[PDB]
Design a protein around this nucleic acid. Structure first.
Length: 240
RNA sequence: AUUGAAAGUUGUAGUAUGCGGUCCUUGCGGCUGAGAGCACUUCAGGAGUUGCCCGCG
């Protein structure tokens, strides 16, 4: 029973919903992007068998393997320790994917990014063997980008720390299943990547307007049976 | 290699042109550092003294 925990320090992340013109950025990074990150890491480290002729097929099979290793499909969780704010940028973003209008068209479009000092993400695994545990620890880092390419991400620390069955208020994100069982946020973040499913997610951020933008901070949901300790601070977490 | 992948919010643009801090103006006129005033009053270069001493055109 092991859980990877890696903290990423990034300027922005621009992963967004299904939307036109504006790509409505997620309030917190989705499980699908988090799974794809270590899928890319593992296919980069060992292309001996995880890399196939089709890049899409190789990524999809890596995702299948990593989700088979996950205790549940809704496993990865994030910690919004730093404040979450949103800003809007006008980007050239030529929209030539439309059927027609040649290729010399320039539609000035507009997008928004999410600013946050840093985040922590958890990868819960079951009884992974050391011969692959070292490889997965190596793949924990090398997560250079999350979502949009311009949204660089830098993992500074990554480690394997056991929950030890501590008691603390919930801090990590969790699906909206036990929170209903016991300022409440409801979202949908596309659990698995879509390739040629969606479940109600509780979002652990609340509003505190001290400045112009209200941004978000800890809502401190109730106490949970499982918790994780990092640098002297204990944070709640739920697993199936 | 994350609904991500391809992508300039891009190229060209003088706050610029003529516009006296300008023309007249006494720091000007009158004005005793002047009047009174002993370097004065007392005073010996003074008292002693053999050109000295010998001499046949």
């Amino acid at each position: 029973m092991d859980i990877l925990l890696v903290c990423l320090r990034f300027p922005f992340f621009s992963v967004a919903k299904r939307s036109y013109q504006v790509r409505t950025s997620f309030l917190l990074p989705p499980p699908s992007a988090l799974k794809g990150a270590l899928a890319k890491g593992l296919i980069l480290l060992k292309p001996e068998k995880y890399a196939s002729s089709s890049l899409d097929e190789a990524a999809l099979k890596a995702i299948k393997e990593i989700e088979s290793k996950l205790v549940d499909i809704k496993a990865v969780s994030v910690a919004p320790l730093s404040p979450l704010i949103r800003n809007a940028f006008l980007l050239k973003r030529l929209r030539n994917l439309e059927s027609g209008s040649n290729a010399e068209k320039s539609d000035a479009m507009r997008r928004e990014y999410t600013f946050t000092r840093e985040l922590l993400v958890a990868y819960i695994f079951k009884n992974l063997t050391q011969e692959e545990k070292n490889l997965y620890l190596k793949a924990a880092m090398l997560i250079d980008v999350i979502g949009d390419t311009e949204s660089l991400a830098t993992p500074v620390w990554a480690s394997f720390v056991k929950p030890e069955d501590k008691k603390a208020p919930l801090a990590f994100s969790a699906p909206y299943t036990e929170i209903y069982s016991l300022r409440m946020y409801i979202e949908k973040m596309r659990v698995s990547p879509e390739y040629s499913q969606e479940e109600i997610f509780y979002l652990p951020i609340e509003e505190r307007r001290y400045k112009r933008i209200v941004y978000y901070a800890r809502i401190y949901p109730p106490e949970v049976e499982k918790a994780l300790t990092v640098d002297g601070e204990v944070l709640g977490i739920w697993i199936p």
